[PDB]
Design brief:
2 copies of one chain form a homodimer. Chain A has 208 residues and is mainly β. Chain A is built from 3 helices and 11 strands; from the N terminus they run βββββββαβααβββ. Chain B: This is tRNA (Adenine(37)-N6)-methyltransferase.
Chain lengths: 208, 212
């Protein structure tokens, strides 16, 4: 049996690469994006009622995932290389209009094709008795060079995004060598940082 | 300007107590007797693909609504079964597994459901404590259930024959109130059984008969 699916829309995302995408995205509220809905579902009628829903599940295609074991069985993990290649994420819904959802705390790559939107239903989706021994790091302290703080603010005004907060929230989640400069792309920016101490990240510069 | 298309195929099929949509409990995880298996098709029937699930109590299943608009109120504000791309998402309790079989508890899946994916439930990522949903179906309040001596005898006899908790499943689905009328007869199919009941009072279900 084969079943054909097609995207209802595509993600526009802060994240351009898989590296600094936080392992706990709901602790990164500055990780924002939009879901641009495709012409059939771009009518506000398809969204009515979501004004009373804070979080939504997105089923999507791992389009940048280019598999039965993972060095752990594939079905015991959330690996991106898996049969049928469908991902599942719960993100916070900040608002919506005809043909667009505003999202926060996302873990989705830019351009991600979305297959479905489901409202998060707490009594059904939040399993209090759930345990998982296979499944997080506490988080590293983040410090700013004075130059980078000014640059994050300027680009935050230009992009109308919480750039400084996003940089801090992704670096704090431990995306190892002293002296070496590291980098990541966020929106249209290149962010550089280093490890002055093994337990401290310092943001060097924000360019774009 | 052309629509992207992606082909998916089942990794396996669900074998389920439930044969019809009626009386499937609204809160399936409070119905541990709602049991079923996922029969995995090759090459996904190898024990290697399951290693580690011994440490995971609950799993997500992505599946096809194989038993078949935007108005439903909006389709994306609901968990309706008729939806674009026709993919369902349920979290079930994982009781155990072997090569090519998962034992599931608290399912809400129809028999024969084609499953597309298995994901481990990850509490820090999947359990949103601050989540709110006003448009959701409120969890069922609960109705009282009483048994005819005949129906309880048959339910336990069929429970031994089927080697399933038939009586427990009956009680757990009826206690969540499938939904009036007083002289009308209602039923639900469980495995190969037909269970019959009625409402002697508006707040009381009486199980009448179990046939099969
Ligand atoms: N469109 C995409 N294609 C491939 N990988 C993606 C992707 N979008 C996000 N990812 C990856 O998904 C990784 C975390 S897991 C995200 C998938 C989903 N949360 C699930 O549990 O199924 C992210 O860190 C990122 O590396
Ligand atoms: N295989 C199937 N095909 C069509 N409907 C199904 C089905 N399996 C279960 N259902 C229906 O799905 C209802 C549960 S709600 C929808 C399924 C899933 N929990 C989700 O949230 O996406 C069941 O009570 C039954 O009415």
């Amino acid at each position: 049996m084969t079943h054909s699916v097609s995207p209802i829309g595509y993600i526009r995302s802060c994240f351009m690469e898989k590296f600094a995408i936080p392992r706990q995205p709901l602790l990164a509220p500055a990780a924002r994006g939009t879901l641009e809905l495709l012409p059939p579902f771009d009518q506000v009628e398809a969204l009515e009622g979501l004004e009373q829903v804070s979080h939504v599940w997105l089923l999507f295609l791992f389009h940048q995932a280019l598999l039965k074991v993972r060095p752990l069985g594939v079905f015991a993990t959330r690996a991106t290389h898996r049969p049928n290649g469908i991902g599942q994420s719960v993100v916070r819904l900040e608002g919506f209009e005809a043909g667009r959802l505003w999202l926060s705390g996302i873990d989705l790559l830019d351009g991600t094709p979305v297959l479905d939107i489901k409202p998060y239903v707490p009594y059904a989706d939040a399993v209090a008795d759930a345990r998982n021994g296979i499944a997080p790091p506490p988080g590293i302290a983040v410090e700013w060079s004075e130059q980078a703080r000014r640059q994050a603010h300027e680009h935050g005004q230009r992009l109308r995004q919480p750039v400084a907060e996003l940089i801090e929230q992704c670096l704090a989640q431990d995306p190892p060598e002293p002296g070496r400069r590291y980098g990541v792309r966020l929106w249209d920016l290149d962010v550089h940082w280093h490890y002055p101490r093994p337990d401290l990240i310092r943001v060097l510069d924000v360019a774009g």
